[PDB]
Write a protein that binds this ligand. Structure first.
Ligand SMILES: [Mg+2]
Ligand SMILES: [Mg+2]
Lengths: 371, 105, 70, 371, 371, 371, 371
């Protein structure tokens, strides 16, 4: 047989066999339900919807979003998502393969324990594993040392990994991920005041985050251009309906990552988090990590992040020592890609959990057996 | 020389021949006490009137019955109940998370 | 014996007496070419409509100005 | 028992049982009295005379004519007529049957009230009814819709009846009936100046109206023929005495109906009355009445009326729509014939007045109970 | 100069300068022509007659009545009337003043267009206006809100006017005016059967409508008194000739307005028309109109209308809210009085049509320029 | 057994078994009663008339119109209509089938509750349902999404339906239906002043609305042609009687729908209502509805509506996005056709009300059970 | 001099000098214009109307409502309102005082920029300020901490204010204000189907919202009483015209706030919004806000809100901790009252904008200078 990996890093959900270059297809992990009396009696009423099916149907559906802050909120919804993805896309039966799970690090045990409980009981499945994002990110990016930032839909990460080892004290964990940012977007956008709030309406913003955003190189100077120029301003349609046209309000959004006042918290932001978290970690290693610096997924998609990142580290580092960052093409897939590699090597045959243990000891097994 | 049959017959005839007096006496006198009834011809009038006007026709039903319009535990309100249950975020998510997250082994 | 005043006056009178012909001739004939104007009564319609509808009323300000916000 | 109908539409008076095709016999409703000293002492003096008895005796009798303008003028004369007709022709006793009365429409109440008063009191008679001419005229002519013209001795009528209903606003009522026309005849006839005025002499004219008259098709053109021809002129005897010969003076008489100048009034005449009275009545019905057009009795007897009628309506109607008229054979009897039908149907047992009401309420009863 | 107003609301015709309290004199708008051979050769034959001149001469004249249903029927007759009134009464020349015209509302354009055409061409006259009756009725009655009933010789009106505006949807228009009522009178009167039909004879009835009529307070109860009493019955002369004496037949006539069966139409009558036409008009205004209720002219002259009016509205209104009616002394003049006010104010100098427009554009001008 | 549907959308009334393509026959829902004394005693008096029977008989009948503004006004009249239609046309007995009812949406409960009460009690009938027009309109038109306009005799509708669901907030409801429009027609038509008001006379107008009307493409430009041309003018007969010829007065009528000043209300009209009611409904759906736009019944019959509709939406829409409308051949039947489909599918066996519930709970049942 | 404050929170508009306890007078901010031809020529036509003047005149006027969703829609209308209020009520000249403006928070910049532009240019006025509602609400209510709900005519608010500071991330903003609720009322009310839609007619509803409403304590239980009782049902007049009587339809209206299905949106409603918006805000503060809870203006007027509010928070809070709400007497004035205090203190002399800045820099000044 063969080995299969689900990404449930939140946002669109990624699933594919070991050794394909990229997953077969991808699903938002929206779940949605009817909102209105069903009034074509000719219609079959189906009461739950997921995936691009929902993505089409949205307007009368309303969304629940089944992962808050990387912790999966409500199990039966997950079960819908998970079940659907296997049967409908994959045409795969749960006995058929090991299945591999992708986890926010350093977050509450419950997601581990129930995830395994469900998947061994509800599905009955040869082998289970839970793996921390950064590890996969390294394997795919193929530099045994590094530090990773990958800020998905959900909770946003720094882990230095040195070659072959963890520094779990080192790690920093932040709720700044693109979802919350997007919901901040609206509180900007009503300034121009083309304005809409409902769940589907909030996802409409996601498209604008695709098209119209780019990262501030320097905030003041950009504002000066804002006074000077309209190239900062671009014209964009509703997905259907109007043309909409957006000022600094585009570029201002990502700045939240650098200055998280605008939806306000204090943790002094990505870059200062990074340099903080290094200076936590020990003295000799540091040069390598200064060399090997790696980024992936949801936030990184924005054009320009790497430049201001370099500006920030060159601010905080003693300039004397090398700095660079990696911005691979494939970042949005990266995690699952690394997972594919992780699945491939025979050593996991040594490493998987098997059903037998789940028979002979509880969910407790996981928390010893995996990281 | 006289007043006679001949003259008297003359008077008789003229009397018989005089249309104005006798006809006037019967017809003109009888014209004045002409009429007393609640005519059935007018019964038609009253009935038609009854059929005539919206103020009787519409109002008799609509004021009377459209007074009392309603009672139900609305099926539309079933929609509201279901929606609010679906969209009581604080109920579902935090109940589920409190239940699970408390258990740490 | 004749064609006369007596009969001729009869014809004259009847003409005068015939309501159907003379009234019909004036009224029915004049009824058909009744109307051509851009009525001022319709000027009212157009003006009210102008005052009537949000798509003119709201949009004239809001599309124009909320264009430039900042 | 059995049911009996008097016609007292004026002129000859018509009486007969229900269901005979035509009344048993007929009487002028002349009444006449002596004019001269009675000088055969051998003669029995009878002081009042009626009926063909008078019609023979006329010359020394002089006439009173007991109905002016359909309203019966002088009651005791009527009582003579009425009494005579029952006993002498009918051999009928007043208890024996219901008796049915035939009325000019829309004319003064008194004739109703006294007629009933007499006939319930002086005669005592099971059932009484008074019916409007046009209704009978329809029943006999058997078309449930129509308009009627029937111009007797007395006042001359238009009633549209629609099937099953009256349009009493519609109705027009005119004093143009043949009697007055006949008296106009003399004021013509003295032009040729064979000339006579007394009551009996006036009835002599009636015969000439029988024989010599016919209706002008077109008045001018007829005058042109009058200049051309003598076929317009015919030779006729006194009832005894002379041969008399009459020119246009024959055809000119009926024209009065079309042009009532010649004895002068204004109501613009029969035909214009008819079209007027229609256009009074409402819009949708009209076609039917344009189709169904019905005529009867005294004036209609003249040859030719129907043609000029069609000429007149084709003048006034928009030609587009159908027009025709009925000219039944039996017109002079028509009224009583219809009355016979009216008498026949058992529903009048529901409908008659009975003596009981006349006991319990006055003459007033009639005016509710009948039309 | 000075400004002059003709009333051609039908019936007697009313004409007078602005600012006199009441018009100088008044003319029936009868037109009449000879009926008989003119046989005094000493007499000058004049072939047309109008005004009280005709009103004296009537007997051999016969009438045409030049306004049916407020629409003026036959132009040359009008021209006679109009010409006569100016020259004979007014001693006025057409150049001398503006002239003001008084119109049935909501009735066919032709009367507007020809009226103006004639008066600018045949007469040549500084300024023309056509005004709707109710407006004048308000100005004279001086309450800026109201509803008006004014039922002349011609077509009978309801217009609510709110202060300063029209509700043209609101308006109801009925052919029930006193003329047709009067002609119904005869079809009553022949019941007592003193009976006459010709044009002059019909106007003789008008006098009886002056003297002998009064309005039924309650119809049944009045009939009960009719059974009880003769005070209902009064004795009246022919204008010359007989004494005539009239029963319920007097009061029954006006009832037609309340129950228009008796000459039969359906529109459920004045009062139900009024409440209908209100409930058409919109919700908030209504109380004012319930307060301000105003009546004028031909029918209103009858004693008693206002009482039964109040009975009818108190029937149909929810009794809770105020009701009253106005019955001013001057009602028969009211229209022209209001017209005088209308003429007075200088704003019509802004408002009149002038000859210049009639030069530069057609009759079409009117229909824009006036209501 | 088999399943049967009455349309009581007002105007002519439509009834037919499930699965026939078109109903067996159709009846105006006129009800009418005598107006005049019944004066052929030979006639059987029947006191109430309905259906084409009345449609023939009209002239002496006068109309009541038993549905105002889609709410059925007076029950016993309905009962006459309903009873007649079943027994006389359908030859059907009330036990025999379910019967299906067709309702104005969003209108007072009473029509539901009494309708059911009568039909379960007076008739005793296996199954009852009440369905909202737009739903049927979609099923027949067969596009699961849409927006519907169907303006019958009665109250005129917009409902967007999205596939399988209602947006009841979205819905707009207007009293502008063809009946009231037709009664406006007369207030135009008296300008040319061939003029008639009574109930039957008002229905005569309906024919003219059939033949002579067509929709203004552009109002000003049409007026310019009105100044230029007589092709705007056509010649038409009375149903019997005159030829009548009609100017702009034909095309001006439908414009009321686009500009409801002319009988004056404010709701800014059909088209602005439609775009309003969309922009009420939510953002994403809109394109589909812009694509799928569907119309039916009484008003839509007019030639040309669809064009000006497109002009109006192209005015108000951002032109960028697709617009079209559907104008099916069968629109006047559409509702009942859809009802037939609705009846056909076995799921209504799941769905009908049954007598049992009506036993065990009140009329209240309906308002839960149906929409 | 002295300092003056306009409230343009929508609905009636509130204006008064600093230090009076309550504003001098108050105006709806209706604007309305003629709808019908002006047909008393005696009337002066004034083409625009505002204020109680309009409130009287309404019926022929039709309304525009110049603030949608707290953003003022159409400037020249505002200018009418504003101009009128100063000159007619206040007898105040624009130079004379500073003027203070009252704003929906977090809503589009344009209202700020144009408001200032107009008031410095069109009026020329010593000092301008724009202040966020909640701040005033606190000052008047005098508790330096709090959370505010004030739901006017326009967009409805939650702001926690901690003593001396804003938590702008915290804030929630909803279009549920009483206007839209009222327009929902009609879609209820037609169930009983006394039914009216036009602008003036919609404001008529406002009165009913004054008199007849009260808040559901518990929705199910109230329905149970609805089955039991008629005390739920009260009898009320039209402002003029009918008595109207209203069932559960009264209390059902406010429930929309708690369950905004009935005009359907999702934001889970006032109470869940409130607890949501707290749990957004940070951890330690919370007890105070749980203690200090403050409400004002348009919606709060309803009897009973505070009770169900307590029920809702006691539902969602851990019951362990104190909860209470404030329901001051003066709530409807509250905003302007607080504004008066705000105006009073000399520190605004430090704080106002002055004309000088508006000279030396643009409208841009505002957005720095004020919140
Ligand atoms: Mg008048
Ligand atoms: Mg406020």
């Amino acid at each position: 047989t063969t080995a299969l990996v689900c990404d449930n890093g939140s946002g669109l959900v990624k699933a594919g066999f070991a050794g394909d270059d990229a997953p077969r297809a991808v699903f938002p992990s929206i779940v949605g339900r009817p909102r209105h009396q069903g009034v074509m009696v000719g219609m079959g009423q189906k009461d739950s919807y997921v995936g691009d099916e929902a993505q089409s149907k949205r307007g009368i559906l309303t969304l629940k979003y089944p992962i808050e802050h990387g912790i999966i909120t409500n199990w039966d919804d997950m079960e819908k998502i998970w079940h659907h993805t296997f049967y409908n896309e994959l045409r795969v039966a749960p006995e058929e393969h090991p299945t591999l799970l992708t986890e926010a690090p350093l977050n509450p045990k419950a997601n581990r324990e129930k995830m395994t409980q469900i998947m061994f009981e509800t599905f009955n499945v040869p082998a289970m594993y839970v793996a921390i994002q950064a590890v996969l990110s390294l394997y795919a990016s193929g530099r045994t040392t590094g530090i990773v930032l990958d800020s998905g839909d959900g909770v946003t990460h720094n882990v230095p990994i040195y070659e072959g080892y963890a520094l779990p004290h080192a790690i920093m964990r932040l709720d700044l991920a693109g979802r919350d940012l997007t919901d901040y977007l609206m509180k900007i956008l009503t300034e121009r005041g083309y304005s809409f709030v409902t769940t589907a309406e909030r996802e409409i913003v996601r498209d604008i985050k695709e098209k119209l955003c780019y990262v501030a190189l320097d905030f003041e100077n950009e504002m000066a251009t804002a006074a000077s120029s309209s190239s900062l301003e671009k014209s964009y349609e509703l997905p259907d309906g109007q043309v909409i046209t957006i000022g600094n309000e585009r570029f201002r959004c990502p700045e939240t990552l650098f200055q998280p006042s605008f939806i306000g918290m204090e943790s002094a932001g990505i870059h200062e988090t990074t340099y903080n978290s290094i200076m936590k970690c020990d003295i000799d290693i540091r040069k390598d990590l200064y060399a090997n610096n790696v980024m992936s997924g949801g936030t990184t998609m924005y054009p320009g992040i790497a430049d201001r990142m370099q500006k920030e580290i060159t601010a905080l580092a003693p300039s004397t020592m090398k700095i660079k960052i990696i911005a691979p093409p494939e970042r949005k897939y990266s995690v699952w890609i690394g997972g594919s590699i992780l699945a491939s090597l025979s050593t996991f045959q040594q490493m998987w959990i098997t059903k037998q243990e789940y028979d002979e000891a509880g969910p407790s097994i996981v928390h010893r057996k995996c990281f | 020389x006289x007043x006679x049959x001949x003259x008297x017959x003359x008077x008789x005839x003229x009397x018989x021949x005089x249309x104005x007096x006798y006809x006037x006496x019967x017809x003109x006198x009888x014209x004045x006490x002409x009429x007393x009834x609640x005519x059935x011809x007018x019964x038609x009038x009253x009935x038609x009137x009854x059929x005539x006007x919206x103020x009787x026709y519409x109002x008799x039903x609509x004021x009377x019955x459209x007074x009392x319009x309603x009672x139900x535990x609305x099926x539309x309100x079933x929609x509201x109940x279901x929606x609010x249950x679906x969209x009581x975020x604080x109920x579902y998510x935090x109940x589920x998370x409190x239940x699970x997250x408390x258990x740490x082994x | 014996x004749x064609x006369x005043x007596x009969x001729x006056x009869x014809x004259x009178x009847x003409x005068x007496x015939x309501x159907x012909x003379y009234x019909x001739x004036x009224x029915x004939x004049x009824x058909x070419x009744x109307x051509x104007x851009x009525x001022x009564x319709x000027x009212x319609x157009x003006x009210x409509x102008x005052x009537x509808x949000x798509x003119x009323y709201x949009x004239x300000x809001x599309x124009x100005x909320x264009x430039x916000x900042x």
